[PDB]
Scaffold this active site. Structure first.
Site, PDB file in Angstrom:
ATOM      1  N   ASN A 157      20.546 -24.220  20.391  1.00 39.44           N
ATOM      2  CA  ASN A 157      20.449 -22.814  20.696  1.00 39.44           C
ATOM      3  C   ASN A 157      19.025 -22.401  20.257  1.00 39.44           C
ATOM      4  OD1 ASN A 157      21.223 -20.135  21.129  1.00 39.44           O
ATOM      5  ND2 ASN A 157      22.284 -19.967  19.163  1.00 39.44           N
ATOM      6  N   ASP A 158      18.817 -21.145  19.868  1.00 34.95           N
ATOM      7  CA  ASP A 158      17.493 -20.617  19.498  1.00 34.95           C
ATOM      8  C   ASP A 158      16.621 -21.551  18.644  1.00 34.95           C
ATOM      9  OD1 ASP A 158      18.933 -18.427  20.549  1.00 34.95           O
ATOM     10  OD2 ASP A 158      17.848 -17.009  19.271  1.00 34.95           O
ATOM     11  N   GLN A 212      19.174 -23.109  15.662  1.00 37.44           N
ATOM     12  CA  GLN A 212      20.594 -22.782  15.642  1.00 37.44           C
ATOM     13  C   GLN A 212      21.380 -24.003  16.086  1.00 37.44           C
ATOM     14  OE1 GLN A 212      21.793 -18.967  15.100  1.00 37.44           O
ATOM     15  NE2 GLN A 212      20.082 -19.690  13.840  1.00 37.44           N
ATOM     16  N   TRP A 227      22.032 -16.622  11.567  1.00 41.84           N
ATOM     17  CA  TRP A 227      21.431 -16.410  12.879  1.00 41.84           C
ATOM     18  C   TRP A 227      19.911 -16.611  12.837  1.00 41.84           C
ATOM     19  CZ3 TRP A 227      24.442 -12.122  16.035  1.00 41.84           C
ATOM     20  CH2 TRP A 227      25.810 -12.468  16.036  1.00 41.84           C
ATOM     21  N   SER A 228      19.225 -16.168  13.881  1.00 38.69           N
ATOM     22  CA  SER A 228      17.818 -16.499  14.046  1.00 38.69           C
ATOM     23  C   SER A 228      16.879 -15.761  13.103  1.00 38.69           C
ATOM     24  CB  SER A 228      17.398 -16.278  15.492  1.00 38.69           C
ATOM     25  OG  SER A 228      18.082 -17.183  16.324  1.00 38.69           O
ATOM     26  N   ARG A 262      19.196  -7.934  14.739  1.00 41.35           N
ATOM     27  CA  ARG A 262      18.910  -9.329  14.430  1.00 41.35           C
ATOM     28  C   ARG A 262      17.505  -9.827  14.800  1.00 41.35           C
ATOM     29  NH1 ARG A 262      22.295 -10.509  19.634  1.00 41.35           N
ATOM     30  NH2 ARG A 262      23.217  -8.492  19.039  1.00 41.35           N
ATOM     31  N   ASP A 263      17.156 -10.984  14.233  1.00 42.42           N
ATOM     32  CA  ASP A 263      15.953 -11.760  14.571  1.00 42.42           C
ATOM     33  C   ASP A 263      14.650 -11.138  14.081  1.00 42.42           C
ATOM     34  OD1 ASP A 263      18.034 -12.963  15.890  1.00 42.42           O
ATOM     35  OD2 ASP A 263      17.357 -12.384  17.890  1.00 42.42           O
TER      36      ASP A 263
HETATM   37  O1  LIG Z   1      22.696 -17.819  17.413  1.00 39.91           O
HETATM   38  C1  LIG Z   1      22.578 -16.427  17.288  1.00 39.91           C
HETATM   39  C2  LIG Z   1      21.202 -16.042  17.795  1.00 39.91           C
HETATM   40  O2  LIG Z   1      21.159 -16.215  19.201  1.00 39.91           O
HETATM   41  C3  LIG Z   1      20.866 -14.978  19.838  1.00 39.91           C
HETATM   42  C4  LIG Z   1      19.951 -15.161  21.045  1.00 39.91           C
HETATM   43  O3  LIG Z   1      20.112 -16.471  21.541  1.00 39.91           O
HETATM   44  O4  LIG Z   1      22.058 -14.292  20.211  1.00 39.91           O
HETATM   45  C5  LIG Z   1      23.078 -15.013  20.902  1.00 39.91           C
HETATM   46  O5  LIG Z   1      24.144 -15.361  20.031  1.00 39.91           O
HETATM   47  C6  LIG Z   1      24.842 -14.274  19.435  1.00 39.91           C
HETATM   48  C7  LIG Z   1      25.994 -14.838  18.619  1.00 39.91           C
HETATM   49  O6  LIG Z   1      27.183 -14.872  19.379  1.00 39.91           O
HETATM   50  C8  LIG Z   1      25.358 -13.253  20.453  1.00 39.91           C
HETATM   51  O7  LIG Z   1      25.757 -12.083  19.768  1.00 39.91           O
HETATM   52  C9  LIG Z   1      24.303 -12.902  21.500  1.00 39.91           C
HETATM   53  O8  LIG Z   1      24.887 -12.133  22.529  1.00 39.91           O
HETATM   54  C10 LIG Z   1      23.632 -14.166  22.053  1.00 39.91           C
HETATM   55  O9  LIG Z   1      22.589 -13.816  22.941  1.00 39.91           O
HETATM   56  C11 LIG Z   1      20.160 -14.167  18.763  1.00 39.91           C
HETATM   57  O10 LIG Z   1      20.307 -12.790  18.971  1.00 39.91           O
HETATM   58  C12 LIG Z   1      20.900 -14.578  17.520  1.00 39.91           C
HETATM   59  O11 LIG Z   1      20.125 -14.376  16.364  1.00 39.91           O
END
Ligand SMILES: OC[C@H]1O[C@@](CO)(O[C@H]2O[C@H](CO)[C@@H](O)[C@H](O)[C@H]2O)[C@@H](O)[C@@H]1O
Ligand SMILES: *[C@@H]1O[C@H](CO)[C@@H](O[C@@H]2O[C@H](CO)[C@@H](O[C@@H]3O[C@H](CO[C@H]4O[C@H](CO)[C@@H](O)[C@H](O)[C@@H]4O)[C@@H](O)[C@H](O[C@H]4O[C@H](CO)[C@@H](O)[C@H](O)[C@@H]4O[C@H]4O[C@H](CO)[C@@H](O)[C@H](O)[C@@H]4O)[C@@H]3O)[C@H](O)[C@H]2NC(C)=O)[C@H](O)[C@H]1NC(C)=O
Ligand SMILES: *[C@@H]1O[C@H](CO)[C@@H](O[C@@H]2O[C@H](CO)[C@@H](O)[C@H](O)[C@H]2NC(C)=O)[C@H](O)[C@H]1NC(C)=O
Ligand SMILES: *[C@@H]1O[C@H](CO)[C@@H](O)[C@H](O)[C@H]1NC(C)=O
Ligand code: NA
Ligand SMILES: [Zn+2]
Ligand SMILES: [Zn+2]
Ligand SMILES: [Zn+2]
Ligand SMILES: [Zn+2]
Length: 535
Positions: free
Chosen positions: A18-19, A35, A78-79, A144-145
């Site tokens: 992921n990210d 991620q 998260w990110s 976030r982020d």
């Molecule tokens: O892994 C979380 C991280 O990913 C992001 C963008 O890729 O958000 C994604 O994951 C979230 C967790 O379910 C969702 O809420 C969101 O809709 C999805 O895009 C970042 O925002 C986040 O930090």
């Protein structure tokens, strides 16, 4: 058996990715976190996985760096991003999920600053450093982020966080003079009405004239004209956009250049499958590197079946174009080290109308190919239809079967012997609806004929390229099993796509140059390198 795993793109040995997270250089070592799901090929139980490199191409694993282990991040990590403090010390700001399911901002720093691979990271209390509450009224579910933080001329740090208030996206900006006590600014650095949530925001300067990278906090050096880039990942559209503008340090706002809007009508880094982009400053080479997450185009069924999902594009060097209207990207030079010393070369070969030219002597599922196309007579290109403004809608309206004066011509990558499967990356040229003789160069990445597996995502991607068709049109494509990264106009337009052929695999893939347009175009030069596997 794994026909779709990349030979040289970054992806974990297994499971869901992921990210890209907190990229940085420290003690001349490149770091990437990301991620990761330690127990699934879908999103979940998300942690900061961690690898290191000396060249951004080969990556050595390490145990996860940031994982749920405290109130401020117990329901996830998260990110976020790494800042490098003026004393060379690196820190990570990341979003954690608390007992109340709130998105909050946490700092983490290494516990052994002499460890060259920064394996173990200690976190506060007093975490979270930044949180929603009754007084700030920030949406606790959309906060976030945090970006890399930058230092102002008033000794105060700034950092932004992607957020939204009622379908208005914003970069909530916090200030701090010690990097420990953070306070929300009354107004955001920027906002857009009608854009959704702003995910993975990024904010960095660029030189107006030069390919080199600029340190993130820099104001000078006098004299040297700077420009600022604000990048957002637009949750609704699932694309990354950026705008070029100036940074009023007085108001502490970001002002997009005249001829931009941050919502929707903005340039993308990549016009294909590309998300959650993040840059870092490579002090080793004075270049800015862009990391990008290409997710999976196959079904979720397929992902759990193969037991992994998600790759990372090969890192891009990024800088401003001379005309100041867009950014240029180009795969980091290091990746060229993966090329075999043998190189299939074709020069001054004509492609008559409806022709194609197989290029042998390469591992055609793991390769780098660069073409120069020369157009014979530009007066032959069709005048672009009046209401053709969306480049993605053009490519999807007219496939390689539909023929233009000039175009379609380009490459057929990841192709089966008898062409039942092929991914076509190509150009079309038009005359514009202007009084000045301007041409519109179209770059498409068509993958509707890409794979025989029917429930793959066959979305066709498209982009305009700001290059003059009087000179020869340049096209590069990195080919890596289930990913092609097409670069048009020497990095002026980039398209990533994801492709899952049933025939065109390993030994059984080509590799064509082609031209189905009315006019015969010339292949001025074609270099093709077989690509060695990384790591
Ligand atoms: O892994 C979380 C991280 O990913 C992001 C963008 O890729 O958000 C994604 O994951 C979230 C967790 O379910 C969702 O809420 C969101 O809709 C999805 O895009 C970042 O925002 C986040 O930090
Ligand atoms: C992670 O990975 C996934 C999968 O790769 C990705 O989601 C996919 O994103 C793409 C876009 O990037 C989506 O592509 C669209 O698909 C719809 C149809 O999808 C529906 O049906 C399928 C079932 O087969 C479902 O998967 C899905 O939930 C939907 O119900 C197409 O209709 C879209 O094409 C239209 O628009 C395109 C321009 O955007 C044009 O190229 C095309 O011509 C189409 O336009 C047509 O209709 C228009 C009317 O709307 C009309 O104007 C035109 O005249 C024309 O006829 C498009 O291909 C894909 O569906 C997504 N799939 C899934 C599984 O969700 C994630 O986005 C990705 N995440 C990240 C972070 O990267
Ligand atoms: C705060 O953010 C949350 C999460 O985005 C919002 O709740 C969502 O709104 C969407 C779109 O209307 C709906 O799908 C659901 O009602 C919620 N879904 C999710 C993903 O949680 C909420 O509306 C936002 N509130 C404010 C005041 O901005
Ligand atoms: C930190 O790193 C140094 C140098 O690699 C190492 O020798 C030391 O054992 C590590 N840990 C501590 C607690 O000092
Ligand atoms: Na480079
Ligand atoms: Zn409200
Ligand atoms: Zn779209
Ligand atoms: Zn804007
Ligand atoms: Zn001319």
């Amino acid at each position: 058996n794994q026909p779709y795993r990349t030979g040289f793109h970054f992806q974990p040995p297994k499971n869901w990715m992921n990210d890209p997270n907190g990229p940085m250089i420290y003690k001349g070592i490149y770091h990437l976190f990301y991620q990761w799901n330690p127990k699934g090929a879908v999103w979940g139980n998300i942690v900061w996985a961690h690898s290191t490199s000396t060249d951004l191409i080969n990556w050595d694993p390490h145990p996860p760096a940031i994982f749920p282990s405290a109130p401020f991040d117990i329901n996830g990590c998260w990110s976020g991003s790494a800042t490098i403090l003026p004393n060379g010390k690196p820190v990570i700001l990341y979003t954690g999920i608390d007992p109340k399911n709130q998105q909050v901002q946490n700092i983490a720093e290494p516990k052994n600053l002499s460890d060259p691979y920064l394996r173990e990271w200690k976190k506060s209390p007093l975490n979270p450093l930044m949180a929603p509450d009754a007084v700030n009224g920030i949406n606790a579910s959309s906060f976030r982020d945090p970006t890399t933080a930058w230092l102002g001329q008033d000794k105060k740090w700034r950092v932004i966080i992607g957020s939204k208030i009622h379908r208005r996206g914003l970069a909530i900006t916090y200030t701090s003079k010690d990097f420990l006590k953070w306070e929300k600014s009354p107004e955001p650095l920027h906002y857009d009405d009608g854009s959704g949530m702003w995910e993975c925001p990024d904010f960095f300067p660029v030189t107006r004239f030069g390919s080199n990278g600029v340190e993130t906090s820099s104001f000078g050096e006098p004299n040297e004209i700077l420009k600022h880039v604000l990048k957002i990942s637009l949750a609704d559209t699932k694309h990354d956009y950026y705008t070029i503008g100036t940074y009023d340090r007085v108001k502490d706002k970001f002002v997009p250049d005249n001829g931009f809007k941050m919502d929707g009508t903005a340039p993308r880094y990549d016009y294909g499958k590309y998300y959650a982009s993040k840059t870092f400053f490579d002090s080793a080479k004075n270049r800015r590197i862009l990391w990008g997450w290409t997710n999976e185009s196959s079904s979720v069924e397929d992902d759990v079946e193969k037991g992994w999902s998600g790759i990372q594009t090969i890192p891009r060097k990024i800088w401003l174009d001379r005309s100041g209207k867009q950014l240029i990207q180009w795969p980091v030079r290091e990746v060229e080290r993966l090329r075999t010393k043998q190189v299939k070369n074709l020069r001054n070969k004509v492609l008559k109308s409806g022709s194609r030219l197989e290029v042998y002597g390469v591992t055609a599922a793991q390769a780098d190919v660069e073409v120069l196309f020369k157009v014979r007579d530009l007066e032959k290109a069709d005048v672009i239809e009046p209401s053709w403004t969306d480049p993605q809608l053009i490519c999807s309206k007219m496939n390689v079967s539909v023929k233009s004066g000039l175009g379609p011509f380009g490459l057929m990558v990841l192709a089966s012997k008898n062409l039942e499967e092929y991914t076509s990356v190509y150009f079309r040229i038009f005359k514009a609806r202007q009084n000045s003789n301007k041409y519109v160069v179209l770059m498409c990445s068509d993958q509707s004929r890409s794979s025989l597996k029917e429930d793959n995502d066959k979305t066709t991607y498209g982009a305009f390229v700001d290059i003059n068709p009087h000179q020869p049109l340049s096209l590069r494509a990195l080919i890596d099993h289930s990913v092609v990264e097409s670069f048009g106009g020497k990095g002026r337009a980039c398209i990533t796509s994801r492709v899952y052929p049933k025939l065109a695999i390993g030994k059984s893939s080509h590799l064509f140059a082609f031209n189905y347009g009315y006019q015969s175009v010339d292949v001025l030069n074609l270099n093709a390198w077989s690509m060695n596997s990384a790591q």
